[PDB]
Amino acid sequence: ADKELKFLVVDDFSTMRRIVRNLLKELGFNNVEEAEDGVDALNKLQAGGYGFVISDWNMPNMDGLELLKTIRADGAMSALPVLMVTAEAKKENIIAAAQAGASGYVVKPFTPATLEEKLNKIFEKLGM
Ligand SMILES: [Mn+2]
Ligand SMILES: [N+]
């Protein structure tokens, strides 16, 4: 994928965002910004420039599932890739994410290898 691809990393906890940001850097992606909930995320997304969202599940103000649905229903942002992160693979979460059109899911805690594989799966599928 293009190393200038701009990522938005969304989580209400700084430590989780820092993990993802560092992993993206290791993979060669330095164009990365952070958001602390779904509303903060949409505010950044609608300001423009983003090509990929990595979002947690549970957040105040607007949670990750709601963020995903809002993105998918948006007349402009509908196609934006969104990788959802879930604390544990409760089948209901995984199912809900799939139904709502998530690009992929990853269960935390996750290894660097797992995130890399998940991202590449999405890139390759989308011809990125
Ligand atoms: Mn959370
Ligand atoms: N939700």
From Swiss-Prot:
Involved in the transmission of sensory signals from the chemoreceptors to the flagellar motors. In its active (phosphorylated or acetylated) form, CheY exhibits enhanced binding to a switch component, FliM, at the flagellar motor which induces a change from counterclockwise to clockwise flagellar rotation. Overexpression of CheY in association with MotA and MotB improves motility of a ycgR disruption, suggesting there is an interaction (direct or indirect) between the c-di-GMP-binding flagellar brake protein and the flagellar stator. Signal peptide: none annotated. Keywords: Acetylation, Chemotaxis, Cytoplasm, Flagellar rotation, Magnesium, Metal-binding, Phosphoprotein, Two-component regulatory system. Mg(2+) binds at residues 11-12, 56, 58. Its main location: cytoplasm. Changing residue 56 to A: Abolishes magnesium binding. It is found in: Cytoplasm. GO terms for molecular function: acetyltransferase activity; magnesium ion binding; phosphorelay response regulator activity. PROSITE patterns: RESPONSE_REGULATORY. The modification 4-aspartylphosphate is found at residue 56. The lineage of its organism: Bacteria, Pseudomonadati, Pseudomonadota, Gammaproteobacteria, Enterobacterales. Residues 6-123 form the Response regulatory domain. GO terms for biological process: aerotaxis; bacterial-type flagellum-dependent swimming motility; chemotaxis; internal peptidyl-lysine acetylation; phosphorelay signal transduction system; regulation of bacterial-type flagellum-dependent cell motility; regulation of chemotaxis; signal transduction. Interacts (phosphorylated CheY) with CheZ (via C-terminus). Its cofactor is Mg(2+). Phosphorylated by CheA or acetylated by acetyl-CoA synthetase, depending on which acetate metabolism pathway is available. The major acetylation site seems to be Lys-91. Dephosphorylated (inactivated) by CheZ. The modification N6-acetyllysine is found at residues 91, 108. This is Chemotaxis protein CheY. GO terms for cellular component: bacterial-type flagellum; bacterial-type flagellum basal body, C ring; bacterial-type flagellum rotor complex; cytoplasm; cytosol. Changing residue 86 to I: Impairs chemotaxis. Binds 1 Mg(2+) ion per subunit. InterPro entries: CheY-like_superfamily, Sig_transdc_resp-reg_receiver, ST_Response_Regulator. CDD domains: REC_CheY_CheY3 (cd19923). It comes from Escherichia coli (strain K12).
